[PDB]
Design an enzyme around this catalytic site. Structure first.
Site, mmCIF file in Angstrom:
data_model
loop_
_atom_site.group_PDB
_atom_site.id
_atom_site.type_symbol
_atom_site.label_atom_id
_atom_site.label_comp_id
_atom_site.label_asym_id
_atom_site.label_seq_id
_atom_site.Cartn_x
_atom_site.Cartn_y
_atom_site.Cartn_z
ATOM 1 N N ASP A 96 0.787 -1.238 0.000
ATOM 2 C CA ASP A 96 0.000 0.000 0.000
ATOM 3 C C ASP A 96 0.820 1.289 0.000
ATOM 4 O OD1 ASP A 96 -2.821 -0.285 -0.300
ATOM 5 O OD2 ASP A 96 -3.087 1.075 1.414
ATOM 6 N N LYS A 113 3.357 1.743 -4.945
ATOM 7 C CA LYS A 113 4.090 1.222 -6.103
ATOM 8 C C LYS A 113 3.319 1.305 -7.424
ATOM 9 C CE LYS A 113 4.400 -2.627 -3.888
ATOM 10 N NZ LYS A 113 3.962 -2.154 -2.536
ATOM 11 N N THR A 114 2.075 0.839 -7.418
ATOM 12 C CA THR A 114 1.283 0.814 -8.660
ATOM 13 C C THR A 114 0.852 2.217 -9.132
ATOM 14 O OG1 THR A 114 0.523 -1.432 -8.123
ATOM 15 C CG2 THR A 114 -0.755 -0.193 -9.785
ATOM 16 N N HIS A 149 2.249 -7.094 -0.655
ATOM 17 C CA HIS A 149 1.614 -7.908 0.375
ATOM 18 C C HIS A 149 2.534 -9.062 0.776
ATOM 19 C CE1 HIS A 149 -1.337 -10.397 2.471
ATOM 20 N NE2 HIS A 149 -2.154 -9.356 2.469
HETATM 21 N N1 LIG Z 1 -2.400 10.561 -0.244
HETATM 22 C C1 LIG Z 1 -1.810 9.721 -1.108
HETATM 23 N N2 LIG Z 1 -2.304 8.496 -1.283
HETATM 24 C C2 LIG Z 1 -1.583 7.796 -2.200
HETATM 25 C C3 LIG Z 1 -0.470 8.193 -2.896
HETATM 26 N N3 LIG Z 1 -0.021 7.178 -3.741
HETATM 27 C C4 LIG Z 1 -0.850 6.204 -3.535
HETATM 28 N N4 LIG Z 1 -1.822 6.502 -2.598
HETATM 29 C C5 LIG Z 1 -2.894 5.638 -2.140
HETATM 30 O O1 LIG Z 1 -2.309 4.516 -1.502
HETATM 31 C C6 LIG Z 1 -3.161 3.359 -1.721
HETATM 32 C C7 LIG Z 1 -2.293 2.230 -2.265
HETATM 33 O O2 LIG Z 1 -1.791 2.615 -3.549
HETATM 34 P P1 LIG Z 1 -1.114 1.530 -4.489
HETATM 35 O O3 LIG Z 1 -0.507 2.290 -5.591
HETATM 36 O O4 LIG Z 1 -2.142 0.522 -4.859
HETATM 37 O O5 LIG Z 1 0.001 0.884 -3.587
HETATM 38 P P2 LIG Z 1 0.873 -0.402 -3.811
HETATM 39 O O6 LIG Z 1 2.185 -0.170 -3.149
HETATM 40 O O7 LIG Z 1 0.938 -0.559 -5.293
HETATM 41 N N5 LIG Z 1 0.040 -1.641 -3.173
HETATM 42 P P3 LIG Z 1 0.472 -3.220 -3.218
HETATM 43 O O8 LIG Z 1 1.526 -3.455 -2.187
HETATM 44 O O9 LIG Z 1 -0.797 -4.031 -2.983
HETATM 45 O O10 LIG Z 1 0.911 -3.393 -4.648
HETATM 46 C C8 LIG Z 1 -4.282 3.814 -2.648
HETATM 47 O O11 LIG Z 1 -5.462 4.086 -1.888
HETATM 48 C C9 LIG Z 1 -3.703 5.071 -3.291
HETATM 49 O O12 LIG Z 1 -4.685 5.996 -3.723
HETATM 50 C C10 LIG Z 1 0.036 9.502 -2.712
HETATM 51 O O13 LIG Z 1 1.021 10.024 -3.261
HETATM 52 N N6 LIG Z 1 -0.708 10.217 -1.767
HETATM 53 MG MG LIG Z 2 0.605 -2.442 -6.346
#
Ligand SMILES: Nc1nc2c(ncn2[C@@H]2O[C@H](COP(=O)(O)OP(=O)(O)NP(=O)(O)O)[C@@H](O)[C@H]2O)c(=O)[nH]1
Ligand SMILES: [Mg+2]
Ligand SMILES: [N+]
Length: 403
Positions: free
Chosen positions: A19, A22-23, A83
């Site tokens: 979370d 990354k994506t 995860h």
């Molecule tokens: N406030 C804020 N929220 C962010 C930012 N970047 C991502 N988020 C939020 O963080 C959450 C996770 O984002 P995501 O890109 O899916 O993270 P991840 O690291 O790819 N997740 P995973 O480990 O499952 O792949 C989402 O609700 C997204 O909107 C940012 O720069 N600012």
């Molecule tokens: Mg991701």
């Protein structure tokens, strides 16, 4: 269409705790680069976390490969899950990277998979790391930011990365992505958040070198995934480690089966663009004649016929993680059967301790013998990770092949 080489190719990607962003960052990179280069197609958040199971669980599960370009270089970017239960997929992703972008949330700081991903990236050969401190839009307090950076740099030092030297770019993947949605033509210098993505792209360009690759050695490609393309056949994907592959080449599929199988390459593509010749470093899909997706699998390697003989038994020098690194609480004995991770390969193996060594404890640097339940392409000096029961327990390097 077709793939035209114009600039050096480098493989990067995103790692870090669940979370942390990354994506969202991966998406933002495609959008930001696309405004400045018309050959980049944008990938939105849902284009990356595209699988029904990812939509269901609300996390990345599968690695995704996206393409983008700067003036200097062409990038393939592997976005990995954070995860804890999908570490196996993260390892296979990192096994393809010439450098990793470690994403760390400014609001949370480093977390257990920040540590675990750094540790694992090393064991599949990631040579350089750039840090993106994400979600700064959520953290006003500039002392908390300095602290997160300090903690991340120190954490990198613990795994022999140059922590005090890595670029740490502070930004918001989400706000940059929002700005690019509102104005897809947003150029560098126009927007505060987008310019932070440019800072990251500059750091990738300049801090992560183009690796020395050998296109003259026998063809070798670890398989990272396998799928069926309707009307064409079975495609094995991966980063070519060395040598070259052209349509019409015979290759051997090595590892994980009782015996090696030969077939003919009938297509080579990079990002769904036709390649005349895949070369070391390319992130490609190789179409394979006369094999189904049940006859080729992740962890096998494609190789020039006769060039690799798989192995089952080896000696290794192993560090067993202390529990303060997410390792075991207790030690283990001969007959311990954890999982061994070599590049994109994941295989159960039996620890056979030497006579006189009854027990191995967390924190021990030790040598022992491993017997894999399946043959695998192995080499002296090859690093590997050891995991068991859903946790990383050890890091090792192959000392000598026994069989
Ligand atoms: N406030 C804020 N929220 C962010 C930012 N970047 C991502 N988020 C939020 O963080 C959450 C996770 O984002 P995501 O890109 O899916 O993270 P991840 O690291 O790819 N997740 P995973 O480990 O499952 O792949 C989402 O609700 C997204 O909107 C940012 O720069 N600012
Ligand atoms: Mg991701
Ligand atoms: N994904």
């Amino acid at each position: 269409g077709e793939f035209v080489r114009t600039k050096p190719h480098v493989n990067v990607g995103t790692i870090g705790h669940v979370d942390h962003g990354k994506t969202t960052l991966t998406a933002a990179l495609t959008y930001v680069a696309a405004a400045e280069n018309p050959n980049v197609e944008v990938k939105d958040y849902g284009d990356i976390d595209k699988a029904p199971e990812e939509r269901a669980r609300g996390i990345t599960i599968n690695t995704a490969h996206v393409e983008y370009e700067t003036a200097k270089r062409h990038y393939s970017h592997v976005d990995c899950p954070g995860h804890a239960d999908y570490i196996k997929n993260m390892i296979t992703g990192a096994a393809q990277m010439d450098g990793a972008i470690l994403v760390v949330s400014a609001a949370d700081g480093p977390m257990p998979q920040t540590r675990e991903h750094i540790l694992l990236a090393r064991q599949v050969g990631v040579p350089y790391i750039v840090v993106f401190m994400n979600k700064v839009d959520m953290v006003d307090d500039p002392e908390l930011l300095d602290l997160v950076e300090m903690e991340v740099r120190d954490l990198l030092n613990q795994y022999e990365f140059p922590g005090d030297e890595v670029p740490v770019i502070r930004g918001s993947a989400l706000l940059a992505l929002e700005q690019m949605h509102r104005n897809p033509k947003t150029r560098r210098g126009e927007n505060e958040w987008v310019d932070k993505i440019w800072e990251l792209l500059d750091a990738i360009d300049e801090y992560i070198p183009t690796p020395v690759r050998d296109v003259d050695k026998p063809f070798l490609m670890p398989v990272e995934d396998v799928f069926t393309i309707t009307g064409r056949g079975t495609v094995a994907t991966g980063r070519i480690e060395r040598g070259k592959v052209k349509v019409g080449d015979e290759v051997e599929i090595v590892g994980l089966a009782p015996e090696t199988r030969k077939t003919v390459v009938t297509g080579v593509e990079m990002h769904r663009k036709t390649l005349q010749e895949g070369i070391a470093g390319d992130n490609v899909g190789v179409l394979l004649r006369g094999v189904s997706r049940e006859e080729v699998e992740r962890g096998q390697v494609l190789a020039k016929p006769g060039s690799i003989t798989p192995h089952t038994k080896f000696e290794a020098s192993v560090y067993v993680l202390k529990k303060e690194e997410g390792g075991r609480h207790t030690g283990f004995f001969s007959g311990y059967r954890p999982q061994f991770y070599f590049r994109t390969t994941d295989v159960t193996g039996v620890v056979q301790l030497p006579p006189g060594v009854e027990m191995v404890m967390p924190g021990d640097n030790v040598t022992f013998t491993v017997e894999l339940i399946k043959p695998v392409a192995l080499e002296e000096g090859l690093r590997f990770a050891i995991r068991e029961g859903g946790r990383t327990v050890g890091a090792g390097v192959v000392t000598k092949i026994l069989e």
